[PDB]
Design a protein around this ligand. Structure first.
Ligand SMILES: *C(=O)c1ccccc1OP(=O)(O)OCc1ccccc1
Length: 106
């Protein structure tokens, strides 16, 4: 089901996620989910941001998945699915650079 998600890019590198997100047309919150390069079993949420100090830039957030079933960036805020995690962060910025807006174009 995760592999079926249009925002799930699978096995792409961190640099590739940055190449895709650093497009001048991408508004704040453009995002994608990929596998972590070095953490087995973990995903990575790559998100674009923009401000006058840094200009267009990218942030990465590790998503952990417990055998017990929960998905989360912070253990205080867990979800029953990756889909629910993405939906929540599309409404709440919380500690992220921006709420998730649009799926990163390829
Ligand atoms: C996403 O998993 C993530 C989160 C924060 C920094 C980088 C990052 O991408 P990774 O593909 O996991 O690889 C780089 C990394 C650097 C430092 C610690 C963990 C991952």
């Amino acid at each position: 089901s995760i592999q079926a998600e249009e925002w799930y890019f699978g096995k792409i590198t961190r640099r590739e996620s940055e190449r895709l997100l650093l497009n001048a047309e991408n508004p704040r919150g453009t995002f994608l989910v990929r596998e972590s390069e070095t953490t087995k079993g973990a995903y990575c949420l790559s998100v674009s941001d923009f401000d006058n100090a840094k200009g267009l830039n990218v942030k990465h957030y590790k998503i952990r998945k417990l055998d017990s079933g929960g998905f989360y960036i912070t253990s205080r805020t867990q979800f029953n699915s990756l889909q629910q995690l993405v939906a929540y962060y599309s409404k709440h910025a919380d500690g992220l650079c921006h709420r998730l807006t649009t799926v990163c174009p390829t």
